[PDB]
Amino acid sequence: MGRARDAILDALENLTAEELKKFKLKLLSVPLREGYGRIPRGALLSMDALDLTDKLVSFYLETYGAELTANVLRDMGLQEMAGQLQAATHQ
Amino acid sequence: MGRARDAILDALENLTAEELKKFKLKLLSVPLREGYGRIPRGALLSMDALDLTDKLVSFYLETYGAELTANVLRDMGLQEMAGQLQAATHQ
Amino acid sequence: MGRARDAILDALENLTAEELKKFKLKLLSVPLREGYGRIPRGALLSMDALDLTDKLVSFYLETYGAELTANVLRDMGLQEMAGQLQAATHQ
Amino acid sequence: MGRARDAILDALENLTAEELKKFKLKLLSVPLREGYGRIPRGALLSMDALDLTDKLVSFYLETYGAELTANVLRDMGLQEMAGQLQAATHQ
Amino acid sequence: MGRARDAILDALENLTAEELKKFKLKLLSVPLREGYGRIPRGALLSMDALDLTDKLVSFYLETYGAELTANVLRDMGLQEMAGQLQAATHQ
Amino acid sequence: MGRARDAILDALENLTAEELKKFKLKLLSVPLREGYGRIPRGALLSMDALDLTDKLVSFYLETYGAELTANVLRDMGLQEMAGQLQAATHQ
Amino acid sequence: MGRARDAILDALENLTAEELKKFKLKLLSVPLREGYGRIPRGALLSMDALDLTDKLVSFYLETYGAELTANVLRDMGLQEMAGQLQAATHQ
Amino acid sequence: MGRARDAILDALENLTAEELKKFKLKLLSVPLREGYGRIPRGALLSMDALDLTDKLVSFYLETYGAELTANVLRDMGLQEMAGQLQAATHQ
Amino acid sequence: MGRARDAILDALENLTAEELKKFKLKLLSVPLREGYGRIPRGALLSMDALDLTDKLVSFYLETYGAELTANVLRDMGLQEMAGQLQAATHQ
Amino acid sequence: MGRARDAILDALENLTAEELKKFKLKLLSVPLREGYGRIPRGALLSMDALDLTDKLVSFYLETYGAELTANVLRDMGLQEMAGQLQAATHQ
Amino acid sequence: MGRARDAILDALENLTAEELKKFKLKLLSVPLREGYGRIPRGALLSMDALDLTDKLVSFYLETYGAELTANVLRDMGLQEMAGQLQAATHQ
Amino acid sequence: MGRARDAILDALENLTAEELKKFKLKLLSVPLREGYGRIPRGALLSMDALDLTDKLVSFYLETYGAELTANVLRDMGLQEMAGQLQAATHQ
Amino acid sequence: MGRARDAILDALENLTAEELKKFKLKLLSVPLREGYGRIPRGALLSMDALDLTDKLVSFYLETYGAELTANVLRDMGLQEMAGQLQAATHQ
Amino acid sequence: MGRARDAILDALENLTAEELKKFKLKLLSVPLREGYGRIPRGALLSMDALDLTDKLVSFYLETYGAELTANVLRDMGLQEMAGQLQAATHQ
Amino acid sequence: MGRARDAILDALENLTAEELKKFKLKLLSVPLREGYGRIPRGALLSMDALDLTDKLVSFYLETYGAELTANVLRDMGLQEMAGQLQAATHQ
């Protein structure tokens, strides 16, 4: 159901351009799950909101991506929209 | 009949630079018609008066855009010029 | 005929600087017309006699503005010049 | 019903420019709710009345923002307009 | 009547360069009909607006392609021009 | 003979900073000529004395600009320098 | 007599960089002649003042380009330089 | 318990505008604690009553700030309200 | 344990925009540890509070970065928040 | 003797930032020499004091540039430093 | 020998704040030398005593500025200090 | 005497990268001699400054090339360097 | 021993905001040493107390900068804090 | 045990895209060992981070490559990650 | 001993981004030694601080480059760091 992926595209939409930069720095820091890794910075600092979707969704499981998304957001994004995603994330 | 689109360009002209910022914020809150949606904040906050035309006119119907224009204006802009457009809006 | 707007500029001219402050305060209290609203105090308390014209004239109809003008004046300003405006207001 | 957000825009309208500065300082101090946090000072001290809204509303739960609103106001704002929002806040 | 294909060439003409990248990402996620498949990522990200026509039109039925076109557009593109195509798509 | 344009630059010189604001407001109201138009308020309110010369002279005919100059001045500027320009204006 | 094309290059020279963006938006809205068309937006919003000559001159009949140039300019550019071109345009 | 900081905001409230200027001067003279320092005059002379709270509280420990407050006050402020703070200061 | 790096992000949060510039200047002057160096000014004058973190943390040891942090702060920052980091810096 | 060019760099150095803008406007209006032309405004309005130098010099004869410099300065710059250049200009 | 300029700074020091205003008004009315001009009022009325030094000194010759100083002073300033400057003016 | 060709290589050297693009557009419009033709745009727009030399020199007579060079430059390039080439072009 | 530079930072701290403007003006006037020069006014007039430090220190020898500091201060600053720096300048 | 080579691939991963260009230049300058040499610039400047691994690891002994790696990094890269490699480099 | 080249890299490090543009302009004007030449402006204006090094060092002798460096710096750079290089330059 790769569709729920798009719903994650709207995650970076409700946020401002200023906010975007911040999300990057905090991505690396977040606690990850075993059997997974981190993404090399080179492209990450560049990769736009969308680039953070195609590579993100592929790099991280979709079911697992949804959960991972919530974390970072409610921790730094701190937006009511963060939940907006969860609403449709599950189903 | 694209031309009338230009007439809208003159709507943001009679308003002060101060007002502009306000108009943006309220744009999101206004009630929309079914079969349509909102515009991502990213570009919107940047997009100047002009940008708010090229993307607005394309995003929203031109016939329907005219009407939409009036709403926001007479609700916040509250300028006599608001009618000025309606004068040229219809024809 | 935005010209008649100027004549208003001169309404605030025959009045003293002390008078000005007073005019501001009362402006809020006056009975308005449906399909019209009030102006946020922020700018208003700052906005000078001139600012009370550019924004005033824009916010309120010019034809209707002339009338609204007479009211406040003859109610607080109480100046023989109040009528001086009406002289040119109509035409 | 994000709409009720605008109603909050009018909250900062009835207050003076002087008042504004005060509101900022007190915002930090107010007792908050778990699962939430405070906004980084940098932008806050700059962010205007409208900047407060767009960020405030997003940073805080609209339903919950309405409540949070009342607190600060009736505590420092101390204005009759405070309740003015409430009457509309609920619905 | 491969002609209607060219009409789709214009679908990507009214959209901005910025928009183009967005369309790509969404293409994959869209619900497809049985008896068909998806296009391999590699070329897809490179393939220009024109490349998305030659390969698209061939990969997808022309009749069926027209419809498929509408979907993606009115869902993400959200442009009044989307209908402009349907206008000629049928004939 | 673009040079005569400079002489206009000196028009805004003999006038105080307070005066400048006034000139802006009255500019819009003046009776214009055909084939021409008014200048959008946006920039105009910002545009300094200099900005009112580079854009002014370009917007309005130089020959015709000189004449237009005198009008506004003697009507509101009300300065002896007003004629000082007409001196070098004609030639 | 290609040369006259160059004279057009000078048209976009007397205008500011701010103005340029504007000219773009209007270009599409202007009434065209039968047996002619419009230019796809993609390149247009990118194409510089120069790009608006090479493609413009080629896309539009030179003799016909001159006339077309006048329209847009005097309608939006609103400059005395507009005619400057016409002076040399004809010959 | 940053809240206690606010109570300090009230310290400068009961005092007149004249007093304020005095408080400033004497702030530099008072004996300080090791592991601490003074605040540069530039901002300090400007910084209003509220500015002497945000920067004061951050600059000086809150627990330690409360004490420091009493000192200066009962020495120059010499007001009954001085103790009024200690009432809330402790707890 | 990268994370603690983030905690530093909050160090530059409680400080004002004015402060920030200052911090930059002092950074160069602080006594350093052998087997380390300084950062080229170019980026260091542009690099925002965030840029400082990403480059600082990488350029300087994390465990060692924490200590270094406290230094500059208590010396110039002179804030009670300075200690706030420490309390969490260790763990 | 390219070097003499540098001296001109110091011409724009003794002048204030406020002055710079002024100099720009006047540049266009100055009488020129046959076998030479003017510089397009687009860049000129942006080009800094230095950008003015590199382009000025290349565009205008160095020997002839020195003279040209004096004119504009004594006419508008109206500074004693104007002669300061002449002292080194010749040799 | 720029230094002698400073001595002029002390010229406006022995005079009261009331005096300052007067000096301004009379500056324009004084007989000037050929090959020199007057200073635009805008800045002048604002430009403080210091501003009158930096701009004056640069505007007028230093050797010539000294003489010019004496004139205005002994004619309006009418102070024994007027000669005080001359004491150091020459050398 | 091919050599003089290399000297033309230095023509495109003293010019900026921005300038380059301009030179291209103009080349086509220049009045050519009889018994000679124009170069197809395809390669010309790509062909670098070095490509504009190998192809140019071969396409145009070397003796006649030098002359042709001066024209385009002194008409658009408008650089004192233009003559620099001539001085060497001849011999 | 870079650090000593910081001490110079504190120099501009004990002085008022009014004082600052003065220091600027009298800086250019001071007698300089061989193998050294003055700083262009542009940035200088802007450059704040801190900007003066970063650029001053780099522009002027540190050992020699300390001395230079004393001169200006005791000659215009005329503050007891002037010597305060010296006590720490030497070491 | 080629594998260790891959770990090197991670070295260029924690560094920014901007950093990369810097690493290149330094590579040439570093002190080398006898029985080896340098790599011809042609490819090197182009060769990406990955290219700097395949060619590097082959051009330089793996065991010896690890050492060489550390050198350049701790000298220019100056990153805490530099040690990160050493951790795994040895084994 | 190409190593001394790197030290020249550190020459551009202590200078601000603003300064950089300036260095470029002057590089051309500086007196040169026979048997050598100047560098074409094209790349030069683009070429960054680093690009300046790689090309500079190769374009000019390293021994001779060291000296050349000093000139430009102490003449325009005018920084105490200029000597800093000489400290390592010689050896």
UniProtKB/Swiss-Prot annotation, chains A, B, C, D, E, F, G, H, I, J, K, L, M, N, O:
Covalent crosslink: Glycyl lysine isopeptide (Lys-Gly) (interchain with G-Cter in ubiquitin): 55
Outcome following mutation: residue 20 to A: Abolishes homooligomerization
Mutagenesis or variant effect for residue 47 to A/N/Q: Abolishes homooligomerization
Effect of residue 27 to A: Abolishes homooligomerization
Variant or mutagenesis effect after changing residue 19 to A: Abolishes homooligomerization
Keywords: Apoptosis, Cytoplasm, Endoplasmic reticulum, Golgi apparatus, Immunity, Inflammasome, Inflammatory response, Innate immunity, Isopeptide bond, Membrane, Mitochondrion, Nucleus, Phosphoprotein, Tumor suppressor, Ubl conjugation
Residues forming coiled coils: none
Biological process according to GO: activation of innate immune response; apoptotic process; apoptotic signaling pathway; cellular response to interleukin-1; cellular response to lipopolysaccharide; cellular response to tumor necrosis factor; defense response to Gram-negative bacterium; defense response to Gram-positive bacterium
Principal place of residence: cytoplasm
Miscellaneous notes: In breast tumorigenesis, methylation-mediated silencing may affect genes and proteins that act as positive mediators of cell death.
Known function: Functions as a key mediator in apoptosis and inflammation. Promotes caspase-mediated apoptosis involving predominantly caspase-8 and also caspase-9 in a probable cell type-specific manner. Involved in activation of the mitochondrial apoptotic pathway, promotes caspase-8-dependent proteolytic maturation of BID independently of FADD in certain cell types and also mediates mitochondrial translocation of BAX and activates BAX-dependent apoptosis coupled to activation of caspase-9, -2 and -3.
Protein name from the UniProt record: Apoptosis-associated speck-like protein containing a CARD
Organism: Homo sapiens (Human)
Gene that produces this protein: PYCARD
Residues of the full protein shown: 1 to 91 of 195
